[PDB]
Paper text:
The native structure was obtained from a crystal formed from a drop in the absence of substrates, which was then mixed with another drop, to which 10 mM maltoheptaose had been added. The intention had been to obtain a crystal of the complex, but no maltooligosaccharide ligands were observed in the electron density. TLC analysis of a similar crystal-drop, where HvPho1 was co-crystallized with maltoheptaose, revealed that the maltoheptaose was hydrolyzed, mostly to maltose and maltotriose. Accordingly no maltooligosaccharides were observed in the electron density of this HvPho1 crystal and we refer to it simply as the “native” crystal. Two almost identical HvPho1 monomers (R.M.S.D. = 0.19 Å), related by a quasi-crystallographic translation, are present in the asymmetric unit of the crystal. One of them had weak electron density for a citrate anion in the active site, likely a crystallization artifact as citrate was part of the mother liquor. Consequently, one citrate molecule was included in the final model. The structure is similar to those of the cytosolic phosphorylase of A. thaliana (AtPHS2), rabbit muscle phosphorylase B and E. coli MalP, including the presence of a pyridoxal-5’-phosphate prosthetic group covalently bound to Lys814 and similar dimerization interfaces. An overlay on rabbit muscle glycogen phosphorylase b suggests that HvPho1 does not contain a functional polysaccharide storage site. The ordered part of the L78 insertion overlaps with the location where glycogen (or starch) binds to phosphorylase, in a position incompatible with maltooligosaccharide binding.
Author numbering:
A (entry chain A), B (entry chain A): 68 to 495, 553 to 968
């Protein structure tokens, strides 16, 4: 009773009765907005039912705050989760359209950037699919980070246009507006209570993005804050006098908070904005959560129940301000005591860490924060004093040098005059250590504040979670060992197998017996025994090849290069950074090119398997060397791809504007993917898990997610190379004292690049970053030269394996069979049970 | 088969499936947006049918361009014209709401200001109602002119908020975008043809506001341009470097065009913007009109047919640039010759003039225009050369001093070097007259360009249209007498009787026999014979009184003052200006107050009829004296309203933020309205006509619309006072040479105001503007003192008439009976036949 012909009518209805175009206009885009709105009707029904039932039950609700959400296109996945994928397809034929064609008109929401945000997004899919009561909270970015375009100069950055016609996947909630305050000062009022007055005032308005679960009515929510000020803040006097910018100054201030993701902060103005961004996310979100708690509790309202009804999860340090903000409201607005409020805060908040380096943890100038959020600094000050008295107790006086060290490590406010209580212990008068030294900045360490303020701290992979306990927060682990956990990352198998790779999905559900694996992904393990079946292997290679043909279109379309699908599709797809070592990959390609060119055309075929080597991802605009690296790759592509001696034996391609949509086409087509960061530098990595699910083989270092992926799929089905994490610091110091001697094959490439064969750029600057023994930006800090021989050898093993397409496809199948551990579903279960302490809420 | 219960469902549907609020939220406002969207579904159906049928028929289409459209609230009138007024009322009861209550939640669109715009709006109602194919073109103003608030300092100006939640009465047309260019320069290309290159580029996007006719499916359109630039014009480099305003500079430039109506132009930046505004309206609109002509013509496309398919009407001089812009496109883009293009332009364009003073006609600096629109100045230059050669022919050489005068009067470009052809005739070398004199600015006279460029020029009232021929454009009238016309203004009887005054409307349709008068307003004349019937008079006075009670609410609500409905409701409602003479009214009130206070409480009742004297309207922010006048009135209100000796004998009230919605409540309640501008200063006036329709009696000067209103309703049913137009200049010169001696009663008031009785302001400054014999801002230029005795006497006749509520109500009824001439319907018929040459297009 829910058929294709009624859907076609509702699509038509939306084109005409919620129109964005002239009636006689006929576009795939017009069809998209109509089809999006037809699907949306289902999400609204289900959203309202889910919203209402949660209020009735009043179960504990989890809240995931992130500065990023890589939502990607919604259409294909909403239709998928509703299981109207077959009927929407036909409905669109009736109207003279094609689903796939219409779906490719959807713009990627510019609401995230990399893994941090995509994880959050996968987490929202799993939460809904498994019927957990949970929302995401975030900011509604207009222009995103940037849309990447590739010219003959390298990468250029253009602002995103995804909101130009409005977002059909959201609902504005005009009754949901919260005030957020900047600057001002604090005064103690009549009733001993603190009051934060004056300053600047903006309002955050709610923009809801429903999150439909798979094979369930449960539709959770992503609440997005958009900043503005009321029309009356427009200065007409300024406007009429001619000063049109002044007239618009107040609106610009509010609105710019939601303009760009991670705005550049090499300026006091960029730092203030980045800080306004975070407080707005924290303040608006917490005010809303508090509001919902109150409305549900009704007359029987008790704040001790707050952490048994509310869980707040801080994705990275960006939402750290939740801690003091919660303390702010509980005391200043609700009237709770410090200890009463602190206990509620500590039990409500938890922190997830994605960093492996202790000098990559968010720091802020106290002076800047003190000016913008004076009441929060007061609160932080009190928190840091408590923390220090607890260290005093749990340790010393007796042994002071020890205590000195414990206080450095754990302090929230670094380089500040100690509170009078602690300062005592260092009289002799006071030790230089217990005083502000103007030679250095006064700094607020957000990571330490997150640890102190949350009941749980977790890493994102087994090895990393240990690094977190041993290197990063050691003295904290000593103090509160029970805080520290691990929650290995995962990705949703619905977006990243079922819907991005339908051809593989059919093969999977045939041989396993059902399509239940989409939900109960453990059942993929039943593929192990069929790994050597010849027929499975036939279908499995055909799918891979069919998925590769959609990439041929993408490459032709986006770059102009013509490539053959009968080569090996070798992909490296991640953010452009020296530590990720795209440079190691391209230089390995350069070596093989060189070998080919010093070889007979008979031997070229005998020695190397044909490849299409694909690069993708964004460089931080200001990062000069990263931009030179994408430039370098493009130039190699130009030289290699148009070389008669090579032909289809090797192609190199840089796919521009890598995003969720690109990944969705690229990943299912991939046979080899590269995860080759300097060992010890990666915490996890989620693209790794996506590739393996799609039967792509991994070449990588013993680093981040690769380690656990290798366990699950088997070491025989993974190409491992390079120095391990423990060996690094030693190899660097070895370099510093002149003892490192690079392979002859590595000097060959460097010289061959300095040769000019890749155009009118020489690159002596880039190659120069792999030379010397010391210096910032030089001295091959990320061990490209060191790992080179091991790496180019490992790629010879890949070639030899690809020669036996029996072995290759066997390993491909074993990767999909070993992926179950990396479903975000079991990641969420672990979070739900061991941190948030929430249960599923199933509607009847 | 279109019943109240289905409508209630559709209202509900829109609340839930085109939502702007949380689902559990319950507001009159929420009900409004839902009810608006339910009505809108009907407008869409009818809009699309009307749009499609016009394309089929390809009849000549009229296009009304204005910088203003005072649309007012749409809800009550759309529901009215659809005749679902009874069923929407019940549908809203079912949902626990009240139509009137819901309607009062609609914000007034800030798309206009005064009469200019309201006329345009009435014109759109009449065009639809009478089935004429016609659109309005305008700009989509965000903040409007300003929302007026009254404090203890006078008026203050706040930006309007009408778009904060979006406009339910519009449809964005994303496929309708047109490029508009600013600055740049001209170059003659390969093919002798001119090309306008470089400069700045913005895009105007179409926002359609359907205009439903009354008792007809015909739903015409108001196309509104909103300016923007594509996201990519956002400078990320600037944003990340910290310079967030610079990053937003390009967007601000585009968007500010649509920010404020009539932005202040005492700055080169305000003048450039005002000029960008007008060109954008002209360019975008003409590009669209041209596009529609082409798509309809198909293969059989002939540009000679353009003026037989297209009429462009310029409301005032603001759209003057249509003339050269049309010439631009026809030659530069379509390839027509000058004469071929000129003939098409002259036959397509027509001009309506609303000005009575020849020094109130829009002038622009040539230098500013030459910089912004260089190609348009070239075209204007050529037009002005033609014009001058035609004057040469039609006159002189022989008589040069004569020719000198004819060229001054008619020139488009004033104070410019004459073209070589004309310059000859003044050799002796060249006369100073035929040269640019840097002592004065170089000026472009837009009015003269409108006259030259249009086939018809019309005034807006019989007397004014004559002034236009005799004083304003005399030498043009001599040259082309057939151009000059009259089209007396009118107002729609649907918004301004039927829907604003339902209680009167019932009485009208009873005694006339039907409600057909709403359409065929001529049938109101049948009320003359019932003027003296006692029963009609009973119902008629009851309605007036019932309508007055809604004003009591408005006054209480907006000012706090408590007033009795059993007094005379005496209203002056128009823009605050010295020439309109609110000051004359208030000073007359001040005189009566003074008399009351020097009188016994028995006599106070014997001498004066109780009144509620209501003022309303906006002062130009920068106009110091106008603002002091509203301040002065408020202070009188404060003193008078709280005086025990007075009580309900006299109240004075300044209703803040006068707009369409205020008028709709105020007008039907009004018994006396004032139209007292210095004689000869007003061209027409439409509020005058509204009042008379609602049975309000007029006190006014022999000026503008009053003259014709007095003819139609009868001199016995109109309170005339003051000096007539011909006597003015003489009375002013009389003042200049010391010969004017004011009434003793006028010095009494002035002194009594200088007395301080009205608070801690003395007003010696304001009273000082009525004193002296010469000087800007002084010397009683608008004859307040002169007309005073005549005026306060005329008000004594009003009192004596109001005493006999038989006579008063007789005259009231005769005003409604005499109003038929002032229906915008017959105004439109005249425009349709004698200018646009269009016919109605009725769908089957
Ligand atoms: C999965 C995914 C990522 C994360 O990639 P890592 O290699 O884990 O950093 C980034 N971007 C997009 C578009 C993705 O789909
Ligand atoms: C009718 C009307 C006007 C025009 O009034 P005039 O006295 O003709 O200038 C102005 N404003 C509003 C809101 C109106 O309804």
């Amino acid at each position: 009773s829910i058929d294709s012909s009624a859907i076609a009518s509702n699509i038509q209805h939306h084109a005409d009765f919620t129109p964005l175009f002239s009636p006689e206009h006929s576009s795939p885009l017009k069809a998209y907005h109509a089809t999006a709105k037809s699907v949306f009707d289902s999400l609204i029904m289900n959203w309202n039912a889910t919203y209402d039932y949660y209020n009735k039950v009043n179960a504990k609700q989890a809240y995931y705050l992130s500065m990023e959400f890589l939502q990607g296109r919604a259409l294909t996945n909403a239709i998928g989760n509703l299981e109207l994928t077959g009927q929407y397809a036909e409905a669109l034929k009736q109207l003279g359209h094609n689903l796939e064609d219409v779906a490719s008109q959807e713009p990627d929401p510019a609401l995230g950037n990399g893994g941090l945000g995509r994880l959050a997004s996968c987490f929202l899919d799993s939460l809904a699919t498994l019927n957990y009561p949970a929302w995401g909270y975030g900011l509604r970015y207009r222009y995103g980070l940037f849309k990447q375009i590739i010219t003959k100069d390298g990468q250029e950055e253009v602002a995103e246009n995804w909101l130009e016609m409005g977002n059909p996947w959201e609902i504005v909630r005009n009754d949901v507006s919260y005030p957020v305050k900047f600057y001002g000062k604090v005064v103690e009022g009549t009733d001993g209570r603190k009051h934060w007055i004056g300053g600047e005032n903006i309002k955050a308005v709610a923009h809801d993005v429903p999150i439909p679960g798979y094979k369930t009515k449960t539709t959770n929510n992503l609440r997005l804050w958009s900043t503005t000020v009321p029309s009356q803040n427009f200065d007409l006097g300024a406007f009429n006098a001619g000063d049109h910018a002044k007239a618009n100054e107040a609106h610009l201030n509010a609105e710019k908070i939601c303009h760009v993701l991670y705005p550049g902060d090499e300026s006091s103005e960029g730092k203030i904005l980045r800080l306004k961004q975070q407080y707005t996310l924290c303040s608006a979100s917490l005010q809303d959560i508090i509001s919902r708690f109150e409305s549900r509790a009704g007359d029987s309202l008790n704040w001790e129940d707050f952490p048994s009804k509310v869980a707040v999860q801080m994705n990275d340090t960006h939402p750290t301000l939740c801690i003091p903000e919660l303390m702010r409201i509980l005391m200043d607005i609700k009237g709770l005591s410090w200890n009463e409020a602190w206990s509620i805060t500590e039990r409500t908040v938890a922190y997830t860490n994605h960093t492996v380096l202790p000098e990559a943890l968010e720091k802020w100038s106290l002076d800047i924060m003190q000016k913008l959020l004076p009441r929060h600094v007061e609160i932080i000050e009190t928190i840091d004093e408590e923390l220090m008295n607890n260290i005093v107790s749990k340790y010393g006086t007796a042994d002071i040098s020890l205590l000195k060290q414990k206080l450095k490590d754990m302090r929230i406010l670094d380089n500040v005059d100690l509170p009078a209580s602690v300062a005592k212990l260092f009289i002799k008068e006071l030790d230089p250590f217990a005083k502000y030294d103007p030679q250095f900045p006064r700094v607020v360490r957000m990571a330490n504040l997150c640890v102190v303020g949350g009941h749980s701290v977790n890493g994102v992979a087994e090895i990393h979670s240990e690094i977190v306990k041993q290197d990063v927060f050691n003295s904290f682990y000593e103090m509160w060992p029970t805080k520290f956990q691990n929650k290995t990352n995962g990705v949703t198998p619905r977006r990243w197998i079922r819907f991005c790779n339908p051809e593989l999905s059919t093969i999977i559900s045939k041989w396993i017996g059902s399509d239940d694996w989409i939900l109960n992904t453990d059942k993929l393990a039943g593929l192990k025994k069929f790994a050597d079946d010849e027929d499975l292997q036939s279908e499995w290679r055909t799918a891979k090849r069919n998925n590769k043909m959609k990439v041929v279109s993408l490459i032709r379309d986006k770059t102009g290069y013509i490539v053959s699908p009968d080569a090996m599709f070798d992909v490296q797809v991640k953010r452009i950074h020296e530590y990720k070592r795209q440079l190691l990959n391209i230089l390995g390609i350069v070596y093989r090119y060189k070998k080919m060119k010093e070889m007979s055309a008979k031997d070229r075929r005998k020695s190397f398997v044909p490849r299409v080597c694909i690069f993708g991802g964004k460089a931080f605009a200001t990062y000069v060397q990263a931009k030179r690296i994408v430039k370098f790759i493009t130039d190699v592509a130009a030289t290699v791809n148009y070389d008669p001696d090579i032909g289809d034996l090797l192609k190199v391609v840089f796919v521009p504007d890598y995003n969720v949509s690109v990944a969705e086409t690229l990943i299912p087509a991939s046979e080899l993917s590269q995860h080759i960061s300097t060992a010890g530098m990666e915490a996890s990595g989620t693209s790794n898990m996506k590739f393996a699910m799609n039967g792509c083989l991994l070449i990588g270092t013993l680093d981040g997610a690769n380690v656990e992926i290798r366990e699950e799929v088997g070491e025989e089905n993974f190409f491992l190379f390079g120095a391990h994490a423990p060996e690094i610091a030693g190899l660097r110091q070895e370099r510093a004292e002149g003892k490192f001697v690079p392979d002859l094959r590595f000097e060959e490439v460097k010289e061959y690049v300095r040769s000019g064969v890749f155009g009118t750029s020489n690159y002596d600057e880039l190659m120069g970053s792999l030379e010397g023994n010391e210096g910032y930006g030089r001295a091959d800090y990320f061990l490209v030269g060191k790992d080179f021989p091991s790496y180019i050898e490992c790629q010879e093993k890949v070639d030899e394996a690809y020669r036996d397409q029996k072995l290759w496809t066997r390993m491909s199948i074993l990767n999909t069979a070993g992926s179950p551990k990396f479903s975000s579903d079991r990641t969420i279960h672990e979070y739900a049970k061991d941190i948030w302490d929430i249960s599923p809420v199933i509607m009847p």
